[PDB]
Design a binder for this molecule. Structure first.
Ligand SMILES: Nc1ncnc2c1ncn2[C@@H]1O[C@H](COP(=O)(O)OP(=O)(O)O)[C@@H](O)[C@H]1O
Ligand SMILES: Nc1ncnc2c1ncn2[C@@H]1O[C@H](COP(=O)(O)OP(=O)(O)O)[C@@H](O)[C@H]1O
Ligand SMILES: [Mg+2]
Ligand SMILES: [Mg+2]
Lengths: 82, 74, 133, 160, 375, 375, 82
């Protein structure tokens, strides 16, 4: 019985240490979750703004093409009327 | 096209469904009471219109705020 | 930076804002009264016989029809723009706060200190074993 | 300044239970009531309250500059009650919006710095190092050259 | 700006509503005129789902809507939806209450009277404008070109009409209105795309076919040579990426869709193309103003934006017309908004300021005032 | 808390019953849904032996019981046992009488009507709740992610279903329900373990095989390479200690058990894997919302917790989908309780407070009220 | 002695649970570490490419302005020619 009491108290201090380790891990978990949420929100915004920029670039490119071609044709016609 | 409901509502409230009143066919006390009731109705209608004007100002503020936020974020 | 300015700052800002709000409300009420007097003048209470009162009531009823059509117009307008205000407030919530609406929550309040079921199970097993003899 | 410290001077048993819990965790009795700010933050993380490290790091950067680690009771309890969320709904959103649009005279969809400074000076509060450039530093997140209602909330969220 | 009062130059159109204050260069808000109720059930609660998305909002949620245009061919077939479109245009795209602004609508030639009368009745009763005026969509397009003569072919999206004008005197007996327009070209393109395997059926996918038509189709200078070339080489096949991937390749469907304009027999219509109804409209005019109309042929409207139409039309008319006359086709780069620019110019004139239909006049004669002197 | 009234967010599930009051983060009581009568004779007198141990009590005395789940595939096959499970859940795991609390059950899509009607009849007659509402298990999992679009694959333990949603409008014609789930994976693992010598037959040992599956199995990124590697080296063989000793070593059974999800031909099922029924469910949707569904693919349910599934599924869909679209797979760490968290959020909403099926309404229309407007 | 032994068994099971907590915490934390790093890298790249597109779009604006002016010139020349 004496030996068993010894083992009981040893396991008792071990259990307290275990609980503390558990709480520390819990706090770390909450922290990392917060960080991940923030960074992912930033990812959303970054992707969306990238898309906006790409679309606008496309539209401006097309308009440039059209106007340039019209100008070239009218230049040819100016020579013709000369 | 089916706009008869809207026009009907507005016109009927204007002419038929309004508070149609005959005022010059009452006794002295009755005519006085009717005139006072109509005066109260007029003043309360003008107060309601002013309150709607204040709400219109608030709506203008909200619309400007929403437009500014959209322009900032889009 | 001092952590002392925040509470006094917010209290003083709240008081100044409340004073400004009540000033604006009283200004609105007074201007409403003045404008209402302008739109419809007050009546008199001396020397009126039946006929002049009848004529005044006819003029008042014509003004009643006028203010009735004015009020119907502004009331339809206010109904439509109050519906618009509700619709656009919901639109703004769906645009910006659509994700914050389910975010405001009350969680992580139970399982952090809920490890005492093992004690109950151990007590139950010990009770059964003791009841055996 | 006065809220947390005054509440400490009229401390309630509701918070005094946790105060004595942290006391017996920290102070063994017949001590100086030290509760070092590093240990204070560590145990505030430990003791089942909200373990937000921002307040802990602020406390570290604020106190225990004497070289001994001793923390006085008043500021310790002030920071203990400040680690929790202590506000009453930040008033009403519609109320504050009306108050700010009354503060807002330009009415261009936002509000400029001049009106905000006028309202702050009309409040009539003392000036410390948290003025002048702290407002500019906090409000300039996207640096739009302006401080709107959203930015006004961003500066001092939870306006009681 | 400030005091004073500016006019609202709205332009209903059919396919794109263009609006803006009088005196500017371009319309302030341009958005499709579609009103689409949701068609599925909807399970999320409190999402703030409305009962009808109008304008440009329904071009983003078109995946779960059933878009339906309220204007079929110039005429208006669904008055409630048109009222909704106008209300949106006034309050959300311009944010100006109509109680303090004159309006200048536009209407195609030869339209039913009841449409115009209902339009003015709505504008005066529901929105309660101070004064509104209705103008023919071709005279404005002639204003914008800065001319005063010329025969204008305004090939919109609903209806193509061809109004000849000389020295400011319109010729009412020479207006040739044809109901082939951009919408029929969209339907025909959607019908010939099925020859390669791509099937678009839903009313939402009509918008995708419209985008294909806008970005890829062009008018061939000579039809048979292009048909022969596209059947031998592969230099024409241009690809396009759908809203979800799966790129498609358009072959000789590119110049066959807009060819319907010059051969309306493709969609089964009997009448002659836009190249021959202009010549017929000219020949109905008097013998002494035909040279001026030949020299000042004006193009307008959206559908005349196809790359290469100003040359095909000139070639066709030169083939039809006598060899001595000079054929010139005015094709300004701002073709799409030509009608609205002309509307702004007309509303900004001082001489025009007394032609509005004032509200007291409507109160005295009813909605039939529009057919009277105030045209 | 105090005055007022909180709602009970129960979630029957099939394999684990999850319950708790509305407005929290995690379910209060989670316990297996098994009811096991004793099967031996019993000689000790006065031991206080009950006739049926339910819930988590029968996972400790499982050595002398015959556990039998009352829910086979979403549907409920044994109503008395299910009533017993509900009674236990209300009275012993939460200790709140149901007479004073609304309930929010959950149900898989495409389930038999009679199951739902019997569920509501039980809740209203036996337990006598004030008001109950039945919700589809996928919409809640979409609530919990804080999205409003996306296609959610909720691979539970009974049945795997794949509900696509856009802008809050569910698409009823694109729900693909497949009956392969965690239970079939447990049976297949128990069947392939026999290739090494370990035979598990008793219904109690199915729990041991389930524990093996949970703790050891993982989804391979590439199946053939893993099959080749496990057949040459021995770096995969992980050992596990049975409830009595005699450790066992699992070789290439580790990634062959959960591979059945992507190749249902292993257990003889004809249909395609969970990697291809998602793509088919997307392709049934309209052409304009496919990009959003591609970008917001959501995983939920217990069985989607295998280590390495969020990469295998993304690789497979990227192989199937067009090369331009971006494929993103949302796999929150709180996957198992995602449905219940969403249920709590939905029950906590103010807009939802008038959708409950009030008892007087049931008294007027009978149990068939659930199919009516109050869905 | 028997009571002490029972206590010991209880402590043993609790220690087991604690080690279980430790392992699961570590696993989840490593997972979130992986996600954090991947998200961060992708966010960086997306921001970079979006800014690139923005620059190209501004260049396109300037090009379009040049072309518009030249078209104005050619149009004036053609009309005078007429
Ligand atoms: N760039 C373009 N190329 C080819 N077709 C176009 C182009 N832009 C518009 N369209 C066609 O013209 C129509 C718009 O015509 P529009 O002038 O807006 O009609 P409305 O006279 O009703 O305003 C669209 O439906 C489209 O089919
Ligand atoms: N960590 C895990 N790893 C692998 N499989 C798991 C894990 N946890 C649970 N499962 C499987 O998922 C099932 C539980 O699924 P669950 O989501 O509870 O189903 P239900 O939808 O009925 O609640 C279990 O039977 C088990 O087979
Ligand atoms: Mg037009
Ligand atoms: Mg489930």
């Amino acid at each position: 019985a004496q030996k068993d009491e010894e083992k009981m108290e040893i396991q008792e201090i071990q259990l307290k240490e275990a609980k503390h380790i558990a709480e520390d891990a819990d706090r770390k978990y909450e922290e990392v979750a917060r960080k991940l949420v923030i960074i992912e929100s930033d990812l959303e915004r970054a992707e969306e703004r990238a898309e906006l920029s790409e679309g606008k670039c496309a539209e401006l490119e097309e308009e440039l093409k059209t106007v340039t071609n019209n100008l070239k044709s009218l230049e040819a016609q100016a020579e013709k009327y000369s | 096209g089916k706009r008869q409901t809207e026009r009907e509502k507005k016109k009927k409230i204007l002419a038929e469904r309004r508070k149609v009143l005959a005022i010059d066919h009452l006794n002295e006390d009755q005519l006085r009471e009717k005139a006072k009731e109509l005066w109260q109705s007029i003043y309360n209608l003008e107060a309601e219109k002013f309150d709607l004007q204040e709400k219109f100002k608030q709506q203008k503020y909200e619309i400007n705020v929403l437009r500014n936020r959209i322009n900032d974020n889009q | 930076i001092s952590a002392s300015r925040k509470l006094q700052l917010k209290t003083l800002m709240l008081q100044i804002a409340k004073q400004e709000l009540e000033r604006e409300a009283e200004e609105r009420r007074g201007e409403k009264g003045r404008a209402l007097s302008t739109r419809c003048q007050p009546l008199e209470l001396a020397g009126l016989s039946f006929a002049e009162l009848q004529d005044l009531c006819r003029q008042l009823h014509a003004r009643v029809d006028k203010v009735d059509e004015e009020r119907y117009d502004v009331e339809a307008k206010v109904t439509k723009n109050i519906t618009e205000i509700a619709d656009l407030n919901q639109k703004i919530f769906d645009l910006r706060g659509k994700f914050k609406r389910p975010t405001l929550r009350r969680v992580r309040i139970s399982a952090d200190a809920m490890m005492q079921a093992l004690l109950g199970a151990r007590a139950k097993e010990t009770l059964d074993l003791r009841a055996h003899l | 300044d006065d809220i947390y410290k005054a509440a400490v001077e009229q401390l309630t048993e509701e918070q005094k239970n946790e105060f004595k819990a942290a006391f017996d965790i920290f102070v063994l009795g017949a001590e100086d009531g030290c509760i070092s700010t590093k240990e204070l933050g560590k145990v505030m993380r430990m003791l089942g309250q909200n373990p937000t490290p921002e307040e802990l790091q602020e406390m570290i950067d604020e106190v225990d500059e004497d070289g001994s680690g001793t923390v006085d009771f008043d500021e310790f309890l002030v920071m203990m009650v400040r680690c929790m969320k202590d506000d009453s709904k930040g008033k009403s959103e519609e109320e504050l919006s009306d108050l700010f649009r009354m503060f807002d005279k330009n009415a261009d969809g936002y509000i400029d710095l001049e009106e905000l400074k006028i309202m702050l000076q009309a409040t009539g509060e003392t000036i410390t190092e948290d003025d002048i450039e702290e407002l500019m530093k906090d409000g300039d997140k996207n640096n739009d050259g302006r401080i709107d209602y959203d930015e006004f909330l961003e500066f001092m969220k939870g306006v009681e | 700006d400030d005091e004073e009062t500016t006019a609202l130059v709205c332009d209903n159109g059919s396919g794109l509503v263009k609006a803006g204050f009088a005196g500017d260069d371009a319309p302030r808000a341009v958005f499709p005129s579609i009103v689409g109720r949701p068609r599925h059930q909807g399970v999320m609660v409190g999402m703030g789902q409305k009962d009808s998305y109008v304008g440009d909002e329904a071009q983003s949620k078109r995946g779960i809507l059933t878009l339906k245009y309220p204007i079929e061919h110039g005429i208006i077939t669904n008055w409630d939806d048109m009222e909704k479109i106008w209300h949106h245009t006034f309050y959300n795209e311009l944010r100006v209450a109509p109680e303090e602004h004159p309006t200048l609508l536009t209407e195609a030639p030869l339209n039913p009277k009841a449409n115009r009368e209902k339009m003015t009745q709505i504008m005066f009763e529901t929105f309660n404008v101070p004064a509104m005026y209705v103008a023919i969509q071709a005279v404005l397009s002639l204003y914008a070109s800065g001319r005063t003569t010329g025969i204008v072919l305004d090939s919109g999206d609903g209806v193509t009409h061809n109004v000849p004008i000389y020295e400011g005197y319109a010729l009412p007996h020479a207006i040739m209105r044809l109901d082939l327009a951009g919408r029929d070209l969209t339907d025909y393109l959607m019908k010939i795309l099925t020859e390669r395997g791509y099937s678009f059926v839903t009313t939402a996918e009509r918008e995708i076919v419209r985008d294909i038509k806008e970005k890829l189709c062009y008018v061939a200078l000579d039809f048979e040579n292009e048909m022969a070339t596209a059947a031998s080489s592969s230099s024409l096949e241009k690809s396009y990426e759908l809203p979800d991937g799966q790129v498609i390749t358009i072959g000789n469907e590119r110049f066959r869709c807009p060819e319907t304009l010059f051969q309306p027999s493709f969609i089964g219509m009997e009448s002659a193309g836009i190249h021959e109804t202009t010549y017929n409209s000219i020949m109905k005019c008097d013998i002494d103003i035909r040279k001026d109309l030949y020299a000042n042929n004006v193009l307008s409207g959206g559908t005349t934006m196809y790359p290469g139409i100003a040359d095909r039309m000139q070639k066709e008319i030169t083939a039809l017309a006598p060899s001595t006359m000079k054929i010139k086709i005015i094709a300004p780069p701002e073709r799409k908004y030509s009608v609205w620019i002309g509307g702004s110019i007309l509303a900004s004139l001082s001489t025009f300021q007394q032609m509005w239909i004032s509200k007291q006049e409507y109160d005295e004669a009813g909605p039939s005032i529009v057919h009277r002197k105030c045209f």
